[PDB]
Design a protein around this motif. Structure first.
Motif, PDB file in Angstrom:
ATOM      1  N   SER A   1      21.494  29.521 101.971  1.00 39.32           N
ATOM      2  CA  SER A   1      23.283  29.023 101.159  1.00 39.32           C
ATOM      3  C   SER A   1      24.398  28.271 101.483  1.00 39.32           C
ATOM      4  O   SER A   1      24.878  28.276 100.933  1.00 39.32           O
ATOM      5  CB  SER A   1      23.344  29.899 100.046  1.00 39.32           C
ATOM      6  OG  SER A   1      22.319  30.349  99.203  1.00 39.32           O
TER       7      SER A   1
ATOM      8  N   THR B   1      23.981  24.625 102.715  1.00 39.92           N
ATOM      9  CA  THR B   1      24.092  24.042 101.761  1.00 39.92           C
ATOM     10  C   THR B   1      25.119  23.727 101.718  1.00 39.92           C
ATOM     11  O   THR B   1      26.000  23.596 101.453  1.00 39.92           O
ATOM     12  CB  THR B   1      22.964  24.340 100.681  1.00 39.92           C
ATOM     13  OG1 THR B   1      22.296  25.886 100.856  1.00 39.92           O
ATOM     14  CG2 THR B   1      23.738  23.618  99.232  1.00 39.92           C
ATOM     15  N   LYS B   2      26.296  25.479 102.003  1.00 37.18           N
ATOM     16  CA  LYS B   2      27.966  24.857 101.742  1.00 37.18           C
ATOM     17  C   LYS B   2      28.140  24.248 102.870  1.00 37.18           C
ATOM     18  O   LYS B   2      28.840  23.012 102.960  1.00 37.18           O
ATOM     19  CB  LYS B   2      28.133  26.082 101.876  1.00 37.18           C
ATOM     20  CG  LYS B   2      27.911  27.184 100.423  1.00 37.18           C
ATOM     21  CD  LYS B   2      28.255  28.454 100.442  1.00 37.18           C
ATOM     22  CE  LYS B   2      27.229  29.518  99.307  1.00 37.18           C
ATOM     23  NZ  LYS B   2      25.903  29.073  99.521  1.00 37.18           N
TER      24      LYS B   2
ATOM     25  N   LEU C   1      31.082  15.829 101.653  1.00 36.63           N
ATOM     26  CA  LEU C   1      32.672  15.234 100.604  1.00 36.63           C
ATOM     27  C   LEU C   1      33.518  14.183 101.559  1.00 36.63           C
ATOM     28  O   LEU C   1      34.191  13.359 100.902  1.00 36.63           O
ATOM     29  CB  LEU C   1      32.615  16.426 100.182  1.00 36.63           C
ATOM     30  CG  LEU C   1      31.809  16.913  99.329  1.00 36.63           C
ATOM     31  CD1 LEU C   1      32.211  18.575  98.270  1.00 36.63           C
ATOM     32  CD2 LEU C   1      32.348  16.463  98.173  1.00 36.63           C
TER      33      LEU C   1
END
Lengths: 1001, 64
Positions: free
Chosen positions: B52, B55-56, B63
């Motif tokens: 997790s 992925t963050k 982005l």
């Protein structure tokens, strides 16, 4: 073995099965073969009569028949005389239905067979059914063309005329359906059925131009048919044909409408896809089921609740009863299509399931049911277990309709007759003979459209004629056309009202209704005098848009296209055009010159036209005969002048010349005193009419609209627009923006709609009524000629549309004050409507695009299926703006493509006040659907709050602008509406971020 | 989505570990502790796993 043995076997089968239970007092067969039932249906007896007639025709080929044809023919005649007598027994209901079609006034369909009387009230049956009447008419004209005699006197001709007039209006009134259940929910609602309208179209086409007395008849044996009703029925079919009903994706009842009894679908490829779909979705091991999710007389069904409870249909699936009778219909279709392979396969399938009597006679039971032991085992494996036969499969009970169809199919399969003999009226034709048929195809061929339309030029005044001649335009004033007469459209409607009147029974004839352009395009002969009429578009209209040359040009072009594309009669159509000297009105004289020059050239927008004198055109042309008649700024404000005395207002009206002030004073006078008051220029109503006509001549749009609001008038075309909107699948709401609104879901009489719209008009505003009239006529015309422009529309709202129109006009004005909408010419409002209705592009502010999209209630293509697949993968549900959508009831009541879910989701979505907020919400839903369907590993842990997600995106983009452009925290999220969805930093990225954050937690 | 420049794996490990420390401080009220043995202890899959946080870090890098 000669034919005698086989024909004797068929005779003994018929005697032991069909004719045994005939009732001699009426000639009508009952619905039950045991228990002394007093109930009788129309379809079964009619089918038995048709089978008996077919057997008689088969046996007619023997000159030593010993009179066996005699009893069969006379049995058919007796049955038809009995059913005709029973229909003519009820006369008041026919007259009541001719004016106010309602279930209360509907003709009864079930009655006692012993004495031809009603036994059951209409509150437990419905009694409304049109397919029976249409099928009866088709069969009766069938046997009249065959050579049988059923009618005796002229009264029955009048009754047939009244029946045709009554069935002409079937394309609007919903029916209970062939199965009597209508909707699949079986709650007591009526929905449109394609099969009924198809049968009505077939009967209407067949009944046209036929001699009812048979061999002998001169002038009192013909039937008159209106082409507009046939055209509207064909349009309703072509629109509704893919789906039999809104609530039914597919039903087995579609086959008879698209098989031998009808032969109505002349589209081959669409026919093939419909047949493939119904075969694939309704095939069963024991035959064909009626339709999906059908608990008809199944094991779980109980005789204690007429109407099914919601969510019971979900439990009722998988145990559907079985009807093998449709194998016989598919056998029939295959044998008329010359495909012996289907014949042999279906015969082999039918052989084992068929039952035998004590003597071995074939038996076809009605329905098949599964015992209670396999209620759950059948669900896991479809068709694994073996069903059980019904009561009418062993002894004592029969299904006369079934043996009738079986015997007719066996008769056709044995090649004892030919398809031509059983169809003398050539209902079905092959592809190579479809060249010169009437009412179906044109002489140019099916895949061709090159019709030439004749147009006649006639002047009105001699001065206008010579003025046009000076410029080279040739026209004829009416005074040199003395042998021919030109009449308006009301002569024909009064003449049509004259016919169809009988004194003994009480008959009003054809209702006074407007005649379409196709009807007026013909040539008439009244009392030996030729009569020609022009379309209703040229006559004087109290409305205002008829004073615009562009509107008239567009309307005449639309009429020319409509004539070109819906004309199939023998002979070229006749078109009459009239030009008035008031049309020129000075500088406006140029576009009419251009249009006349283009008309003289020969082509008008790809349509070929011919011009010549009327005398040559009328000569050498077929004229239709009507011989029935022989046998038979303002300076006055509302608030300031409201309290003024009557005499002061009268004096102000006398000494004022402004039109707006005069109109407002007349309005105050009528509101206070009344329409019966007397003024200096006669009565109040007469003065209002005079000032309105003066304004119309002067073309003051605000004045004419205000006078029109005074006149309490309405266009005679709203009902076609509302019904075509309804059959398309859209919804219409009448009301004002920001005020109460009325929703329409089913067709309504013009009186109720006029009442409700005018009460609303009296409540809120003054000149709106004509405004919604103009918008609705324009929208209907655009959807008629440009249907794909309104793609994505579900609920159309005139108030929201006109508000968006005013907002866009205000933006266009900018520094200059926004121009008032009441003073805009029809061309300007049409252009602005076409501009706002455009798909729109970039350049303008994205906020304005969002506003106009939300005001129109735009939805993306495939949004509904995305919502459905979201809820299927949403264990909890979706809550938006305080509304809840529980998953269990919508999964246990609803399915994939049915409209009720779309209505519910639109209802829960429509609570959003800000249209651009709604568009943001739907875009977020689409993004969520895409991201969830792309990855099945991630699943929602609980119900999602869309408001929370949009607020999180709000905060995140606020932070992002604070970092980038150093913009402080600003209230309202309008900058987001400004921000485009896609680009360097769009809304879609932030929606994806919010979704990712929600899934991670 | 495509990368705009060379990725630094050490940097990514650093943001993942810092985010893990922030989450641990928020949940269990654990102060800033040196070394990544706590991150090594956490399984890659579960209620809150290493995957997790990775992925963050990946989405944060893509982005920008």
């Amino acid at each position: 073995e000669t034919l005698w043995d086989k024909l004797d076997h068929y005779y003994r089968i018929v005697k032991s099965t069909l004719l045994l239970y005939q009732s001699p007092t009426t000639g009508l067969f009952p619905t039950k073969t045991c228990g002394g039932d007093q109930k009788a249906k129309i379809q079964d007896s009619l089918y038995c009569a048709a089978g008996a007639w077919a057997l008689a025709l088969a046996y007619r080929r023997i000159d030593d028949d010993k009179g066996r044809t005699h009893e069969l023919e006379h049995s058919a005649i007796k049955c038809m005389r009995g059913i005709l007598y029973c229909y003519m027994r009820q006369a008041d209901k026919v007259q009541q239905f001719k004016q106010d079609p309602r279930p209360t006034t509907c003709l009864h369909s079930v009655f006692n067979v012993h004495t031809g009387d009603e036994l059951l009230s209409y509150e437990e049956y419905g009694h409304l059914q049109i397919n029976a009447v249409s099928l009866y008419l088709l069969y009766l004209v069938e046997m009249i063309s065959s050579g049988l005699q059923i009618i005796y006197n002229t009264d029955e001709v009048s009754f047939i005329q009244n029946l045709v007039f009554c069935v002409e209006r079937v394309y609007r009134v919903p029916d209970f359906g062939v199965w009597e259940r209508g909707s699949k929910y079986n709650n007591g609602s009526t929905e449109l059925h394609s099969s009924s309208v198809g049968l009505a179209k077939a009967a209407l086409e067949a009944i046209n131009g036929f001699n009812l007395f048979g061999n002998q008849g001169c002038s009192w044996s013909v039937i008159f048919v209106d082409l507009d009703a046939h055209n509207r029925n064909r349009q309703t079919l072509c629109s509704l044909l893919p789906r039999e009903s809104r609530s039914h994706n597919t039903d087995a009842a579609l086959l008879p409408c698209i098989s031998y009894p009808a032969f109505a679908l002349d589209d081959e490829v669409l026919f093939s896809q419909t047949l493939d779909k119904v075969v694939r979705k309704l095939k069963g091991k024991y035959g064909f089921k009626r339709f999906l999710r059908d608990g008809y007389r199944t094991s779980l069904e109980d005789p204690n609740r007429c109407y099914y409870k919601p969510a019971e249909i979900k439990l009722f699936d998988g145990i559907e009863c079985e009807f093998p009778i449709f194998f016989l219909y598919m056998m029939i279709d295959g044998v008329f299509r010359g495909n012996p392979k289907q014949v042999q396969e279906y015969q082999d399938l039918l052989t084992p399931v068929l039952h035998h009597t004590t003597e071995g006679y074939p038996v076809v039971p009605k329905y098949y049911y599964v015992p209670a032991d396999f209620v759950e085992y059948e669900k896991n494996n479809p068709g694994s277990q073996k069903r059980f036969p019904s009561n009418c499969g062993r002894d004592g009970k029969l299904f006369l309709w079934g043996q009738a169809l079986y015997i007719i199919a066996k008769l056709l399969a044995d090649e004892l007759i030919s398809p031509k003999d059983i169809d003398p009226v050539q209902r079905y034709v092959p592809l190579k003979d479809q060249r010169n048929v009437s009412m179906r195809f044109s002489n140019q061929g099916p895949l061709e459209n090159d019709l030439v339309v004749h147009v006649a030029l006639i002047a009105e005044s001699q001065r206008l004629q010579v003025f046009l001649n000076t410029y080279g335009i040739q026209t004829q004033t009416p005074q040199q056309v003395e042998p021919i007469q030109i009449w308006p459209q009301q002569e024909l409607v009064k003449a049509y009202l004259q016919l169809g009147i009988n004194e003994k029974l009480g008959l009003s004839g054809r209702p006074d209704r407007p005649i379409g352009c196709l009807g007026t395009s013909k040539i008439y002969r009244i009392l030996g005098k030729t009569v020609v009429c022009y379309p209703i578009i040229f006559d004087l209209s109290d409305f205002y848009m008829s004073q615009d040359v562009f509107l008239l040009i567009d309307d005449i072009k639309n009429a020319l296209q409509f004539i070109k594309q819906y004309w199939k009669m023998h002979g070229r159509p006749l078109f009459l055009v009239l030009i008035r000297e008031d049309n020129i009105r000075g500088s406006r004289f140029n576009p009419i010159l251009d249009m006349l020059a283009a008309l003289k050239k020969g082509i008008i927008g790809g349509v070929k036209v011919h011009v010549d004198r009327l005398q040559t055109l009328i000569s050498g042309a077929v004229v239709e005969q009507l011989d029935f008649l022989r046998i038979s700024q303002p300076d006055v404000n509302i608030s300031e002048w409201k309290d003024k005395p009557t005499h002061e207002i009268l004096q102000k009206l006398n000494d004022c010349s402004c039109l707006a002030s005069q109109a407002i004073l007349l309005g105050i006078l009528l509101k206070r005193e009344g329409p019966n008051f007397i003024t200096k220029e006669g009565t109040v109503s007469d003065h209002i009419e005079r000032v309105y006509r003066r304004a119309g001549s002067q073309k003051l749009w605000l004045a004419v609209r205000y006078g029109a609001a005074f006149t309490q008038k309405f266009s005679s075309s709203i009902a076609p627009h509302i019904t075509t909107f309804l059959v398309h699948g859209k919804q219409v709401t009448l009301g004002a923006f920001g005020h109460e609104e009325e929703v329409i879901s089913n067709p309504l009489s013009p009186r109720v709609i006029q009442n409700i719209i005018y009460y609303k008009c009296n409540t809120h505003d003054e000149r709106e009524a004509v405004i919604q009239q103009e918008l609705v006529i324009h929208i209907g015309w655009i959807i008629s000629n440009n249907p794909e422009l309104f793609s994505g529309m579900l609920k159309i709202r005139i108030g929201w549309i006109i508000h968006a129109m005013e907002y866009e006009l205000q933006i266009r004005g900018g520094d200059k004050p926004a121009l008032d909408l009441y003073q805009l010419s029809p061309s300007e409002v049409k252009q602005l409507l076409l501009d706002i209705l455009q798909p729109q592009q970039n350049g303008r502010c994205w906020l304005n695009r969002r506003q106009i999209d939300g005001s129109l209630n735009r939805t993306p293509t495939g949004f509904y299926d995305r919502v459905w697949q979201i809820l299927e993968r949403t264990p909890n549900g979706i809550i938006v703006a305080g509304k809840h959508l529980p998953q269990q009831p919508t999964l246990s009541d609803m399915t994939m493509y049915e409209m009720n879910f779309s209505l519910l989701v639109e209802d829960t979505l429509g609570n959003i006040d800000q249209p651009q907020y709604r568009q943001i919400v739907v875009e977020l839903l689409m993004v969520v659907s895409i991201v969830l369907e792309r990855n099945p590993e991630l699943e929602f842990q609980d119900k999602v709050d869309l408001d929370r997600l949009v607020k999180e995106a709000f905060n995140e983009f606020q932070k992002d602008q604070s970092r980038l452009k150093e913009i402080e925290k600003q209230d309202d999220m309008t900058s987001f509406y400004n921000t485009p969805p896609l680009g360097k930093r769009g809304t879609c990225s932030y929606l994806t971020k919010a979704v990712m954050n929600l899934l991670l937690e």
